[PDB]
Amino acid sequence: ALQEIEFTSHNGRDAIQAWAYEPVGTPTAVVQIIHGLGEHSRRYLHMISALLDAGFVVIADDHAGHGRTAMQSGVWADAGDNAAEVVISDELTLQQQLAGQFDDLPWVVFGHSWGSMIARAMATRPGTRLDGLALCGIVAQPRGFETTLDHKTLAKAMATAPTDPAPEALVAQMFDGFADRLSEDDGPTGWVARSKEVVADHGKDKFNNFGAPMSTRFLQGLADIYAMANGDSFYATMPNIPIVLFAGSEDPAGDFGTGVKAVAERLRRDGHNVELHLYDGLRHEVHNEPESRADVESSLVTFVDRVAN
């Protein structure tokens, strides 16, 4: 069965476009997919079908400024003021759309990229439905967020022109070093996947519209959520539930595996239950990379079944 869900965003502007997918028979879990920057939930058709095949309910929305939400509002790469709280609030609202349908079932959040940051921030909030946390394309200690992005210049832009397009200089700082292991023929979004076919399709997909100029307030939202996901308060408040991590060793977002190993090691030192899948030689979208997609999906099913046990 298919449900179309719409609700007003926390930003009061966007009709959030959302879908629930129910398998045949009696489902054993709910998986909530949280897409990343400059993409959309219906890009996950393969994964959704694999999870339905496993007996899970899947629920996903196109965030503020993204996908069909952007296509219907006409607003791309902006989510309103307090953009981090908007997209966190809307992912909570999404859970409430199934209230009284699957209340007895375990609930896993799978977040990719910006989605890994939204999933991490969500996790730390009381009231969130969360029995297991799965993170993919994990943004963790990249040079751009950690050091290159100039908080003083951003703060001046936030004070004077929050809703205007983000200055190019600031945007470049956020992506600093993302092309450090690419060739010229990989193109500037070569970091998305080793597979040129995956990258080509990413750049064609009208529901991605990747590279729509972001607003200054949307860039502040990325810097806010980064600090919410990688900050001391994340580690201090992460609940004692199973966690699984999927990343490419060749992904700049996770500082070429170094950032992702540090997340795993800090969670482990703090006594957490952590499963790490670090794909050697693969780039950001290990769930879309033809070498790793089957392994990510089968590990994700195994993980949801373990949460359920």
Next chain:
Amino acid sequence: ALQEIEFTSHNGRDAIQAWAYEPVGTPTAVVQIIHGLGEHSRRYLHMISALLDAGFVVIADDHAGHGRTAMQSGVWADAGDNAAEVVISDELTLQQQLAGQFDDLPWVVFGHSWGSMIARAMATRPGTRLDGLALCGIVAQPRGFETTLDHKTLAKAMATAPTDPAPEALVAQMFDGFADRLSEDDGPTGWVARSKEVVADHGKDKFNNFGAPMSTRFLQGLADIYAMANGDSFYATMPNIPIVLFAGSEDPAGDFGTGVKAVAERLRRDGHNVELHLYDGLRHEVHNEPESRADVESSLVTFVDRVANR
């Protein structure tokens, strides 16, 4: 990649809701899915994903009176006047929504149930894109359309009240014998699948809304497309292309296997290239039956690859 496509129906009322699904890499074929009565195209997620895995573009719409088209228009189980011509015209117009994008690729039509009848009706038309024809849940020789449905009573209803709800007697006659191999607990839609799970999901899915009252003119479109799909012109004009048939032996729509055998036999007699998959013990939706889904999909992929190879 994903495209949302909408066009005005041939009926001049409905915004046909449609989608194109593009695989990563260079596609090798296009597959048009044509859904059946009281269902919708997004029900085919498993199949679409499998065809994408195989390097095929997939294109599908919710027909007039169906799925998201009905949800947006508020009109369920009616496709306007000349309903058979409307749903055929709308499938040809769907093809043209990709004009210039995939002009070099072979095009396969996959049609389930009512869609098997739409697909067959399309194949007889000059300028249809059709490099291979795949039929599922085939409607052929069931007693209801063949004998029980009273065309004098249908003509009276169309003369006097074509937009009224179809008289319950004509609807009963059209479906006569569909529960001949069902128990009371299988319920009236038990013919859909052996799997009680599949039938329950079919009932629950809000984009099916199976059982909304059809209009009289819509019922006339089903009688009309039955004749277009199964009449002598179908066999006499069938293109020199590969054909694959998938049906369950316990599917009343094919006269419990007997009608599907009649279709394959007549095409073979005339020298056509026919592949028959008749699944013992299974009912109508062999693409959704857990026992046969993998076989229907893997057979369809190999079939499309053969069409492209040719």
